[PDB]
Amino acid sequence: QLSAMKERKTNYLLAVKRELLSEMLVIEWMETFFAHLRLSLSPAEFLSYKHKFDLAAANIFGGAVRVDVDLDSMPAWMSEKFILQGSFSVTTAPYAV
Amino acid sequence: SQLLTGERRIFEYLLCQVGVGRSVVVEDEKEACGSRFSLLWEYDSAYLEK
């Protein structure tokens, strides 16, 4: 049960962690690509593809980041604090009708 | 040995702005097929891992 209540929250929180990490993955794929541009292009090609690099990051990534997270875009499910009290005990006792 | 024209083509593509979000990690395509997964209203896409 506690794993089901855990994955009620943590499957949502690492979904938005994954959501912004997919953004870092395309941010990184921006950088590893252009690192290969600099080592390979002609000096004329660098200016033509740097301006296209400017316009690429201003049109794939120019808008505000839509991964908004403070406490409220989350539903009310992520405000609970589970507790679990009780006591198990083994007894050699009769049944006391 | 061979000059390569390489049969240049008629690639017709659709640049679809696919908005995925809060994806659940899922295995290969055979179980992420709509009629057998049935996502909640929070999660909105399925990440095919393998």
Partner: peptide, 18 residues
Amino acid sequence: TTSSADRFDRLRDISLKN
């Protein structure tokens, strides 16, 4: 090479089964 690298390959696997 040229920065990135070691942080690219660690978050390539975005499935956080860790």
